[PDB]
Design a binder for this molecule. Structure first.
Ligand SMILES: Nc1ncnc(N2C[C@H]3CC[C@@H]2CC3)c1Cl
Length: 167
């Protein structure tokens, strides 16, 4: 049993709810919240800008030190950093950004990072300002992630479309 509430069950392991990952993280304090990161861990908008704002910029400060030591992530890659006031840990995952020309096949590699964590509060990857088709992102998620994932998708006309089109 866990603390996640109000989710629709899509499969054995994937759940979906119309909630802000920020407001959802603040309520649940999950072990892992996933950030929709870029390779530079520059949290400017969407899930990343919103998560970072909710940490009062502490996520960005920590991230800048990580990059100064380790250099940029790979597209499809991830790192584990603090969850600050939102979660125990934040898994920063880089999905491909279509608005930069990245290979959408890298989306499966991105979601494979989730399998290193038994439970994750997570966003839809490459959604939003990353430019991918969210229906495709949900299909890759279901077909790739084997651990228990709670997607918080803060957007009605899209939540309802994802549910009503889910095979
Ligand atoms: N705070 C959030 N929580 C959950 N999902 C978010 N997404 C999901 C789609 C794509 C990125 C943005 C817009 C709707 C955000 Cl910004």
């Amino acid at each position: 049993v866990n603390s996640f509430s109000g989710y629709l069950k899509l499969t054995d392991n994937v759940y979906i709810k119309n909630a802000d990952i920020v407001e959802e993280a603040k309520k649940v304090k999950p072990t892992v919240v996933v950030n929709a990161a870029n390779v530079y861990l520059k949290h400017g908008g969407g899930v990343a800008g919103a998560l970072n704002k909710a940490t009062n910029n502490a996520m960005q400060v920590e991230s800048d030190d990580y990059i100064a030591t380790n250099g940029p992530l790979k597209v499809g890659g991830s790192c584990v950093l603090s969850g600050h006031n939102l979660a125990k840990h934040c898994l920063h995952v880089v999905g491909p950004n279509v608005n930069k020309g990245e290979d959408i096949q890298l989306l499966k590699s991105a979601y494979e990072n989730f399998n290193q964590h038994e439970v994750l509060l997570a966003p839809l990857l490459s959604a939003g300002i990353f430019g991918a088709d969210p229906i495709h992102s949900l299909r890759v998620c279901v077909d790739t992630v084997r651990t228990n994932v709670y997607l918080a998708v803060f957007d009605k006309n899209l939540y309802d479309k994802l549910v009503s089109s889910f095979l």
